[PDB]
């Protein structure tokens, strides 16, 4: 360690060895978590009140979606000390299969990424969480395909 550098910061990436779950990690190469940011239950805990930049990306992969009725979601939520209800700050939905379902052929690997980012005023003790409804379609194979992070502006 040479130069100090500061601000609450976090850039966590999904655990590749979790398969059917999205577990956030910080001890893996180009990942960061320092200066007060806590990771409790896959939740980032704000250490100080101020303006933050919140972002997250998720990559979905399925092997030839046979079901027209497929819905993929990705949302970053906030539970604050002032108002103790989970509300979505950033949200996105994506329909991966436009009915087109493989009939007389073989599998069709589809990939769908979703990216979210925004600036918010957060308070001390706020709990941020990035979650998806289909954690069985997670593709954490490669490296920077799924992540979640904040930086104090």
């Amino acid at each position: 360690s040479r130069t100090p550098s500061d601000k609450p910061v976090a850039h966590v990436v999904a655990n590749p060895q979790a398969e059917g779950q999205l577990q956030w990690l910080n001890r893996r190469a180009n990942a960061l978590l320092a200066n007060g940011v806590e990771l409790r239950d896959n939740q980032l805990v704000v250490p100080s009140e101020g303006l933050y930049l919140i972002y997250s990306q998720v990559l979905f992969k399925g092997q030839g979606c046979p079901s027209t009725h497929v819905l993929l979601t990705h949302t970053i939520s906030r539970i604050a000390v002032s108002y103790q209800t989970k509300v979505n700050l950033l949200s996105a939905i994506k329909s991966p299969c436009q009915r087109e379902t493989p009939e007389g052929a073989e599998a069709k690997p589809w990939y769908e990424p979703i990216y979210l980012g925004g600036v918010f005023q957060l308070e001390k003790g706020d709990r941020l969480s990035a979650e998806i409804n289909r954690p069985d379609y997670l593709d954490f194979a490669e490296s920077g395909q799924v992540y979640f992070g904040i930086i104090a502006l």
């Binding site: 108002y83 103790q84 209800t85 308070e123």
Partner: protein, 112 residues
């Protein structure tokens, strides 16, 4: 759930008085900058209810709840009433809303 309007469905008689209560759950909103809005049955315009006379408002800052007692009820006072509040913390300024429907019936005016 960010202000809670309690009386959802009401059915009162012409000549009564309904009181509607709203409770603040966001600790940044104040009971001082409160507003009330009604939507008369059949119209799509949200009108601004006035503070005075037949519409009396009781506020208690301790529990972060305010109420609105309405007297002399007729049959033209059937509509959706919502409550509002002004919140302010850091660089943020926002407001909150509710929901609730009113239905008023008549007395038939017995003719001898």
């Amino acid at each position: 759930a960010r202000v809670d309007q309690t009386p959802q469905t009401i059915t009162k008689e012409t000549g009564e008085s309904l009181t509607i209560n709203c409770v603040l759950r966001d600790s940044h909103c104040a009971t001082s900058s409160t507003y009330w809005y009604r939507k008369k049955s059949g119209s799509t315009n949200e009108e601004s209810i006035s503070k005075g006379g037949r519409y009396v408002e009781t506020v208690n800052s301790g529990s972060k709840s305010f109420s609105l007692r309405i007297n002399d009820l007729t049959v033209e006072d059937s509509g959706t009433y919502r409550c509002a509040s002004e919140c302010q913390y850091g660089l943020a300024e926002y407001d909150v809303y509710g929901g609730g429907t009113v239905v008023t019936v008549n007395a038939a005016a017995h003719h001898h």
